[PDB]
Structure 1
Amino acid sequence: PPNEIYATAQQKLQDGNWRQAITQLEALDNRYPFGPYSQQVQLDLIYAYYKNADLPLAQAAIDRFIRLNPTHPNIDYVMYMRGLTNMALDDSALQGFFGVDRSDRDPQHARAAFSDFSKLVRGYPNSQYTTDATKRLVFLKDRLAKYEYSVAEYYTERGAWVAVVNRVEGMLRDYPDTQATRDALPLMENAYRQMQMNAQAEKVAKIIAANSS
C-alpha cells in the first residue's frame, strides 16, 4: 500500500536531517504517478531540494508543476520558490565568504528571478508572499543596474564614447530609479565632453545639479 510510506514521510530537516526526507519521498512519485498523493509529493520535493543545495534538479521540478495543472488554488508558493532557486545561484559562494561585491558577475541568474516575481506581484496582489517579493525586487533591480555601471566604468578608461553613452541611455530606460543611474550620470557627461558634442553635455549638466544626492 502507498499509505505505509507516506506515514513515515514526515521526518523532515527539523525532525531528522537533510538526507532522510528524500529516500521515502522519491519512492512515492515514480511508482504512483496517478495515486492518491499526486500533487502532495510534488510540493514536497521542491522544499526539500532547496535547503539541501539541490539547485538544478529542483528547477526541473518547478516547471513540471505549472505544466500539468495551471488551476492550482495556492499557486503562489511554487512561483515564489522559482525566484528563490534563481537567487540561490547568486553570491552565496566562497567569493561571498570573503565579502566582495559580485554585482559585475553573470546577471543571467538575477534576471531570471525577475520575470517570475513580476507575475507574482501583478497576478496575485493579495497573496501571502507579496510583501517579501516586493522587498526582494528592490535588491534585484539594484544588482542589475550595478552591472551596467561596471560596463561603463570599463569603457571610460579604455575610451569608447559611443559605448559609454549607450549603456547610460540604456540605464535611463530600464532602471530610472536607482543609485547606479545617479552614479553613471557623470560618466555620461564625461563622454560628451571628450567628443565635440558640447550641446549634449549641457543637458546632462543641467540634470546632475538639479538632482542633488
Structure 2
Amino acid sequence: VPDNPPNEIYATAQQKLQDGNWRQAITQLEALDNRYPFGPYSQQVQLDLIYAYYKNADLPLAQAAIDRFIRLNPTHPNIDYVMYMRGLTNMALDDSALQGFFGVDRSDRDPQHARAAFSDFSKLVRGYPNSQYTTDATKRLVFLKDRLAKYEYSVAEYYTERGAWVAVVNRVEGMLRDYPDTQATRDALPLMENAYRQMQMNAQAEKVAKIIAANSSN
C-alpha cells in the first residue's frame, strides 16, 4: 500500500467501499489507522472499519473493534448504530456454517450467542426507543426468543426419549416460566402431560389437560 495525504486515501477507501468489494477496503482503512492514527476524521474510519468487518465475515476483529469503540466513545451521537451493529454481529455469528441449506435445522447448537444478542437488543430497544433501527430490532427479538425456546424444547424431547422423567418436568416448568407466549411451549405441554403419568401422579395430569384444552389447537 502506497502513502498519500490522508484525504485522498480516505477517498479511494470510500471508492473501494462503493463498488461492493471489501477485501481491498479493509487494507486501506488499516492504513488510515496506521499512518495517521489520530487524524481529524478517525470516527468515520472506525465505523467504516466495523462495517467492512461485518460485510466481509471477519467477526472476531469486528467484536474487538466494537468493544474498543464502546470503550473509547461512551456518548457518541450515533451510539444506536454501533449497538445495532453488535446485535447483528452476535446474531449472524449463530449460524457460522453451511447447514441451513442442506436440510438440517440448526436449533440444537450452542445457544449462548442468541442470549448475547437478546441482551444487546434489549438494551437497544429499551434505551433509544425512537431511533431508525427499532422496528427491525423487535423482529429480530421475536425471532430470537423462538430460536432460544426451541433449544429447551429439543432437550426436553431427548429426556423424554431417555426416560429421565424428573428432568422433563423441571425443564417444561422452566419453559412455562420464562417463555410463556411462544410456539414451542404449546407444542411441549403434551411432553409434560405424558411425563406426569409415568410417575403415577394423577393429581396434575388433569391440570395439564385443562391448560391444554382451554387453549386453541395451535
Q: TM-score, normalised by structure 2?
A: 0.92
How far apart, CA to CA, are the structure 2 residues paired with 1:140 and 1:46? 23
CA deviations 1:165-205 (Å, max 9, x no partner) are 11111111111111110011111111111103211222111
Q: CA deviation at 1:31?
A: 3.4
CA deviations 1:108-162 (Å, max 9, x no partner) are 2211111000011100110101000001111100010000011010000111111
How far apart, CA to CA, are the structure 2 residues paired with 1:3 and 1:157? 64
CA deviations 1:32-83 (Å, max 9, x no partner) are 3322112111101111111211111101111111111111111111011111
Q: Name the residue aligned to 1:40.
A: 44
Paired residues of 1:121 and 1:134 also in contact (CA < 8 A): yes
Structural RMSD (CA): 1.4
Q: Name the residue aligned to 2:175.
A: 171
Q: CA deviation at 1:101?
A: 1.0
Q: Where is the helix percentage greater, Structure 1 or Structure 2?
A: 2
Range with greater deviation from structure 2 (13-22 or 114-123):
13-22
Range with greater deviation from structure 2 (65-74 or 5-14):
5-14
The gaps in structure 2 that reach 5 residues or longer are none
Range with greater deviation from structure 2 (79-88 or 14-23):
14-23
How far apart, CA to CA, are the structure 1 residues paired with 2:47 and 2:202? 60
Secondary structure of 1:17's counterpart equals coil
Secondary structure of 2:188's counterpart equals helix
Count of matched residue positions in the alignment of Structure 1 and Structure 2: 213
Q: CA deviation at 1:93?
A: 2.2
**Given the alignment, which residue of 80, 90, 104 partners 1:100?**
104
How far apart, CA to CA, are the structure 2 residues paired with 1:120 and 1:90? 19
**Given the alignment, which residue of 178, 183, 196 partners 2:200?**
196
How far apart, CA to CA, are the structure 2 residues paired with 1:91 and 1:38? 32
Report the CA distance shift for 1:204/1:160 in structure 2 as closer, same or farther (over 3 A): same
Q: Name the residue aligned to 1:156.
A: 160
How far apart, CA to CA, are the structure 2 residues paired with 1:210 and 1:16? 54
Q: Name the residue aligned to 2:54.
A: 50
The gaps in structure 1 that reach 5 residues or longer are none
Paired residues of 1:11 and 1:20 also in contact (CA < 8 A): no
Paired residues of 1:55 and 1:88 also in contact (CA < 8 A): no
Alignment of 1:5-154 (within 5 A): 5-15=9-19, 17-91=21-95, 93-154=97-158
Secondary structure of 1:26's counterpart equals helix
Secondary structure of 1:182's counterpart equals coil
Q: TM-score, normalised by structure 1?
A: 0.94
Range with greater deviation from structure 2 (171-180 or 8-17):
8-17
Range with greater deviation from structure 2 (48-57 or 30-39):
30-39
How far apart, CA to CA, are the structure 2 residues paired with 1:177 and 1:101? 22
